[PDB]
């Protein structure tokens with residue numbers, strides 16, 4: 064219950080990643096939530112937060128998330144450790160590949176969120192992305208279940224390892 068996984072999902076992908084993630088961390092470690100059925104209180108509740116957001120319709124944010132953003136910007140993230148994950152399509156929307164991860168970064172970083180979990184952009188092949196920490200790493204875990212589902216298992220296995228460390232446990 065140290066970690067609170069909050070996801071948005073429209074066709075189920077991010078919802079599954081969240082669940083693989085919690086499996087890997089374990090239950091007494093983290094609880095998963097559908098941001099759509101979540102509240103401010105529900106988010107402020109945890110100290111370590113994992114936020115999952117898939118990018119929709121040309122750089123936009125999954126609507127459950129889009130609509131929660133205002134509440135999101137009311138939360139003081141100062142004193143909190145966050146990580147970010149999401150889903151994207153690097154071949155049909157290569158020019159907005161996981162931009163949503165970037166939008167949720169901007170809408171939380173100034174708020175004092177201590178972000179963790181940058182992921183190497185090695186192995187992906189998008190044309191552009193607004194969710195990059197540096198131009199060799201996304202700001203979070205980018206999962207492409209549409210084009211690279213075969214790499215989804217390992218990406219999560221390794222990324223969760225990576226965050227477990229950065230967070231310490």
Ligand SMILES: Cc1cc2nc3c(=O)[nH]c(=O)nc-3n(C[C@H](O)[C@H](O)[C@H](O)COP(=O)(O)O)c2cc1C
Pocket residue numbers: 071072073074075076077078117118119120121122123125150151152153156159160161162208209
């Ligand atoms: C019409 C349409 C627009 C989309 N636009 C984007 C986009 O701008 N960025 C991106 O990387 N993925 C884009 N995607 C792909 C989704 O983010 C991807 O399918 C993701 O796995 C969906 O996760 P969800 O099931 O959790 O919503 C789009 C998908 C569709 C069908």
Ligand SMILES: [Ca+2]
Pocket residue numbers: 210211
């Ligand atoms: Ca493929």
